[PDB]
């Protein structure tokens, strides 16, 4: 397994990456620091998740003490919903910037296809509990998107949480300047995205896994929710292997052809999942995991439901 994918502005992806959502700015430092040491080279960030000065920090300690250069380093953040006018989008990126102590984004994102009311509040919700949307676009938030690639702020852009009509609006615009270089999509067994992954590759862009394990720690979860990590069937195939059932869940998108992005801040966890390029999955395996998808959606906000870009609505 090459640890890499070619991306269409001819840099070269970590098909394994580290997300930090839910990853405590009391906590993420090490847990990048650690990351790092064990072989990480991709950091899956954004504004939202309110860590991104500690994640910088982890970042510039490694670069001083000479463990890793920038240019082998592969950091994405994500451009957050309240900020896709046309006028924030720059200033956006910027403070993700300086928080992340960086000069350039290898990769910068499209969080969600939907805006929200500008504002101080990430989640604007009226009096009934309806997200507040903004009188935005995805076209004219992508053109904007596409300026940063032209001050050279980041390297490459893309989206996430795009269903496949919201990513043809994109590819369909006359005077595209830059096409996405990657969706950034939930992906698991029990939602294995057949049909938006043949589609996405189909056209040259670059599939990311996020939740690959199932985000247990998600703050709306149900003890009646379906849980990836405790599937006694996963378990099998893990035992067989002699992995973990975590490492199963992270080769599985790899063999997809797809990046993936599990999180952790512990650290002997963040040590496991990395080992996961010394095995492979069979055959039978990857046919009996993907017969596992159910169409669950962890990644899911009912108070969006209703705006106009929200992109569950599509079957795909
Ligand atoms: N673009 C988007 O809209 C979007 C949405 C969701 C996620 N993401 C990105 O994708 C990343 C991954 O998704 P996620 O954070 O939702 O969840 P995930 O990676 O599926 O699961 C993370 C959870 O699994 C635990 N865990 C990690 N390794 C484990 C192991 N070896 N054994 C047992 N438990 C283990 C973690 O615990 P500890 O950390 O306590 O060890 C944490 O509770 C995010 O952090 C974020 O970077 C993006
Ligand atoms: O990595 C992540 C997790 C994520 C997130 O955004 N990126 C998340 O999917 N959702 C759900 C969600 C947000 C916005 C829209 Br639109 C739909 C939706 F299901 C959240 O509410 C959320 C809330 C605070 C966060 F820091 C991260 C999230």
Known sequence: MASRILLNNGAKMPILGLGTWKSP???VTEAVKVAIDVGYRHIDCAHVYQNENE?????????????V???????????????????????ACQKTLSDLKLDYLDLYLIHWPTGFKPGK?????????NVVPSDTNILDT?????????????????????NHLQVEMILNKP?????????????????????????????????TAYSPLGSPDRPWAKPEDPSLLEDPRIKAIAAKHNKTTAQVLIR??????????????????????????????????????????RNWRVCALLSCTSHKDYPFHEEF
């Open 25 to 27: 700015p009391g906590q």
């Open 55 to 67: 994640v910088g920090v982890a970042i510039q300690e490694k670069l001083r003490e000479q463990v």
């Open 69 to 91: 250069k920038r240019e082998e380093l592969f950091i994405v953040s994500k451009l957050w919903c309240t900020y896709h006018e046309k006028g924030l989008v720059k200033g």
């Open 121 to 129: 509040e990430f989640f604007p919700l009226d009096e009934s509990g």
């Open 142 to 162: 992508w053109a904007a998107m596409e300026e940063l690639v032209d001050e050279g702020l980041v390297k490459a852009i893309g989206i996430s949480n795009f």
């Open 175 to 207: 005077g595209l300047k830059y096409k996405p270089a990657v969706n950034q999509i939930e992906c698991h067994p029990y939602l294995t995205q057949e049909k938006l992954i043949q589609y996405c590759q189909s056209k040259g862009i670059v599939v």
């Open 252 to 293: 599985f998108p790899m063999q997809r052809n797809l990046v993936v992005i599990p999180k952790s801040v512990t650290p002997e966890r963040i040590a496991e999942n990395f080992k996961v390029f010394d095995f492979e999955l069979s055959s039978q395996d990857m046919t009996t995991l993907l017969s596992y998808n």
